[PDB]
C-alpha cells in the first residue's frame, strides 16, 4: 500500500504473477507528480520528449510512489536535475547526458551560455512543504523482453508432481499444453529441453 | 457547452435522438479528472478494476464535467471515498459496500 500509480502496457498486472520472460530491465528516476503521465508510450510532454521516451510497441509496467521523506531537504533540493531543452526528441530508450549549451534562437552559443543560450539541465527544488503537483516521486519502469530463447524470468508458483499416465494440462518452463506424458527410448540432445 | 467529456461507445450521439430503447440506466459518481479516462470499456486501472467496471458489450454514453466549484472545500472535502484494495477484480456492473 505504497504505490500511487501502477500501470501495464502489453500485459495485465493481475495475470503477471504467473508469466515467464527472457529478461526484464528496470529504469529508475525521480520526477514530479504531474510528470507521471508523461511516462507512457505515445504520450507527449517535456519529460516524454527530452528525458524519457518509450516505443509505440513498448511492453512493460510503470510504478510510482511518493519519495519526499528521503529525497527532500528543508532548504530545497538541487541534487536532482532534468533536461529542459533538446535539439530533437529522444529516440526510444535513449539516454543523454550531454551538457552542451542549447540555442533557442539565432545567436550561436559557441560553447558559452548567453541570451537564448542556456544550460540544458534544470534543477527541481524539492521542499518538504512543496505542493503535491511538484512533490518528488520515485518511479521504476519494468520493461519486459521475450525472445526465441529459453525464458530465465519465472514466477514463484510451486511445481506439481508428475502425473504421468493420465490426461493432464502441463506447463514445463512456460511451455504449456494438454496431453498425456509417458517415457520413451527417445535419446535427446543433451543440452536443450524439449 | 457544459460538459468537458462526452464519449459515446457503440452508438453515435448525433443519431441518438432517433433511437428507441428498452430502458436506460444512468450511473453517477465523482472522480478526479485525471482518472476520467478510466471510465471506458476495456480499460485497466484501480478505479475500473475495483469500483466501476463496464462490459465489453457496453452500448452507451459517458459524460464527465468539472465540479470544483460544487464539490470542493477550503479545508478539504473528504465526503467522497473510493475502494483501494479488493480480494479479486470487480465484475461488470457490480457494487460492494
Amino acid at each position, epitope marked *: 500500500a505504497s504505490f500511487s500509480t501502477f500501470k501495464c502496457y502489453g500485459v495485465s498486472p493481475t495475470k503477471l504473477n504467473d508469466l515467464c520472460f527472457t529478461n526484464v530491465y528496470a529504469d529508475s528516476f525521480v520526477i514530479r507528480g504531474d510528470e507521471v503521465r508523461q511516462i507512457a508510450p505515445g504520450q507527449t510532454g517535456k519529460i516524454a520528449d527530452y528525458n524519457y521516451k518509450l516505443p509505440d510497441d513498448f511492453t512493460g509496467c510503470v510504478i510510482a510512489w511518493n519519495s519526499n*521523506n*528521503l529525497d*527532500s*531537504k*528543508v*532548504g*530545497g533540493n538541487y*541534487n536532482y536535475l532534468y533536461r529542459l531543452f533538446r535539439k530533437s526528441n529522444l529516440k526510444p530508450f535513449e539516454r543523454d547526458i550531454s551538457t552542451e549549451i542549447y540555442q533557442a534562437g539565432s545567436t550561436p552559443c559557441n560553447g558559452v551560455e548567453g541570451f537564448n543560450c542556456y544550460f540544458p539541465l534544470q534543477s527541481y527544488g524539492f*521542499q*518538504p*512543504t512543496n505542493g503535491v503537483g511538484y512533490q518528488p516521486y520515485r518511479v521504476v519502469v519494468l520493461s519486459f523482453e521475450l525472445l526465441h530463447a529459453p525464458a530465465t524470468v519465472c514466477g514463484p508458483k510451486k511445481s506439481t508432481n508428475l502425473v504421468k499416465n493420465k490426461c493432464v494440462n502441463f506447463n514445463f518452463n512456460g511451455l504449456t499444453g494438454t496431453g498425456v506424458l509417458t517415457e520413451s527410448n527417445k535419446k535427446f540432445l543433451p543440452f536443450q529441453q524439449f | 457547452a457544459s460538459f468537458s467529456t462526452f464519449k459515446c461507445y457503440g452508438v453515435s450521439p448525433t443519431k441518438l435522438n432517433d433511437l428507441c430503447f428498452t430502458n436506460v440506466y444512468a450511473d453517477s459518481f465523482v472522480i478526479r479528472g485525471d482518472e476520467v479516462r478510466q471510465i471506458a470499456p476495456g480499460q485497466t486501472g484501480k478505479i475500473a478494476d475495483y469500483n466501476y467496471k463496464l462490459p465489453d458489450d457496453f452500448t452507451g454514453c459517458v459524460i464527465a464535467w468539472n465540479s470544483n466549484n460544487l464539490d470542493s472545500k*477550503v*479545508g*478539504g472535502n473528504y465526503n467522497y471515498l473510493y475502494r483501494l484494495f479488493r480480494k479479486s477484480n470487480l465484475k461488470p456492473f457490480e457494487r460492494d459496500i
Partner: antibody, heavy 119, light 111 residues
Framework: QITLKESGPTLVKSTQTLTLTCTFS??????????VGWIRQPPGKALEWLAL???????RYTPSLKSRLTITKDTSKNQVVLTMTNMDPLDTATYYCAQHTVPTIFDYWGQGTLVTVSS | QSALTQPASVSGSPEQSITISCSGTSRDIGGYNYVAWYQHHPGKAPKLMIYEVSNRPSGVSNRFSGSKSGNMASLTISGLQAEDKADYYC??????????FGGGTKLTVLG
C-alpha cells in the same frame, strides 16, 4: 547506541569569535539521509534553530544569521566545528547539536553547552 | 500567525486521559501535513512523540495520539503517571522554508 557530546569553553567575550566542537560516535556522517545541525535556547524562551549540514556537504543556514554562522566538518575526525562572529551579550544561552533526518527533526540531541557573552 | 498555539499548562488526575490542544492556521497546520508534538522533561533534552499527524512514536508508549483537525491538533495523552510531569511543544513546517515551534506547555499530575 548513538552517542553525542559537545566541547569548548563556556565563557565568551563580546565581539570575539565563538568556537564550539560537537563530537559524535556510533555512526558515520557520510551516510545518505544523515546530517548534523545546531540549535540554541535562551532561558525562558523557545529554542532558536541556527543551521545544519547534510551528508553531502550542502550546508544550509537560517536567513537571519547567515552572515554570522559558519560550520566545518570532517567524517574522519568524528566531530564538527561551529563558529560565530561578533558575539553579543544576548547570545547567552544553551547550545545543542543533533542529528538531522527529515521528518524526525533532530531525532537525537546532545547534552548541550552553557554559553555566556560578557566582558 | 507564524507561530503555533499552546496553552499555559495542563494537569489531571492520575491514570486519567486528557488532551493538549495546539492551534494555528491552514497555512501551516491542518491544511498541511508534517505537524509534530514534543515532550520536554525540564533540564533534559526533549524527545519526539508525534511526528506527522497522529502516528505512534518511534520508540515510546502508545498512550499518546494526534488529531487531524482542519486547523487544530490534539495530543491525547492517557494514563497519567509521575514520570509524565513535563513541558510540551508544538512544531510544524512553515509555508516558507522555515520551521517554527509553539508557545510551550506545562503538564503535572496533581500530586
Amino acid at each position: 547506541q548513538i552517542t553525542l557530546k559537545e566541547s569548548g569553553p563556556t565563557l565568551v567575550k563580546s565581539t570575539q569569535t565563538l568556537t564550539l566542537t560537537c563530537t559524535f560516535s556510533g555512526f558515520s556522517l557520510s551516510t545518505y539521509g544523515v546530517g548534523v545541525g545546531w540549535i540554541r535556547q535562551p532561558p525562558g524562551k523557545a529554542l532558536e534553530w541556527l543551521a545544519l549540514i547534510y551528508w553531502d556537504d550542502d550546508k544550509r543556514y537560517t536567513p537571519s544569521l547567515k552572515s554570522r554562522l559558519t560550520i566545518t566538518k570532517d567524517t574522519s575526525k568524528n566531530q564538527v566545528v561551529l563558529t560565530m562572529t561578533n558575539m553579543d551579550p544576548l547570545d547567552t544561552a544553551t547550545y545543542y547539536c543533533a542529528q538531522h533526518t527529515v521528518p524526525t527533526i533532530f531525532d537525537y540531541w546532545g547534552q548541550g553547552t552553557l554559553v555566556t557573552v560578557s566582558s | 500567525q507564524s507561530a503555533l498555539t499552546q496553552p499555559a499548562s495542563v494537569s489531571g488526575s492520575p491514570e486519567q486521559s486528557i488532551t493538549i490542544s495546539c492551534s494555528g492556521t491552514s497555512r501551516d497546520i491542518g491544511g498541511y501535513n508534517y505537524v509534530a508534538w514534543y515532550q520536554h522533561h525540564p533540564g533534559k533534552a526533549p524527545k519526539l512523540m508525534i511526528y506527522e499527524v497522529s502516528n505512534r512514536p518511534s520508540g515510546v508508549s502508545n498512550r499518546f495520539s494526534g488529531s487531524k483537525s482542519g486547523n487544530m491538533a490534539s495530543l491525547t495523552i492517557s494514563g497519567l503517571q509521575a514520570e509524565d510531569k513535563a513541558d510540551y511543544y508544538c512544531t510544524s513546517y512553515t509555508t516558507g522554508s522555515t520551521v517554527v515551534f509553539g508557545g510551550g506547555t506545562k503538564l503535572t499530575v496533581l500530586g
